[PDB]
Amino acid sequence: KLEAILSQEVEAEIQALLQEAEAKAEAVKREAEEKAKALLQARERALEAQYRAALRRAESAG
């Protein structure tokens, strides 16, 4: 039959789509974690700068 052909045609597209769309929902979850990570790394860098500078200022004053 012609109908036994057709059911294999949907079940084929509808797995490719759902693997593509779990390869976007994975990729985003990665890039966002590495984003979140880097936005606290940069937060680390700032704190040092502002404390190293500050201690020198208060020393020179005294």
């Binding site: 976007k24 929902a25 985003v28 979850k29 890039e31 966002a32 974690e33 984003k35 979140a36 936005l39």
Partner: peptide, 10 residues
Amino acid sequence: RAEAEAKALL
């Protein structure tokens, strides 16, 4: 959902 999880995370 993943975009929502990224938005709220950042």
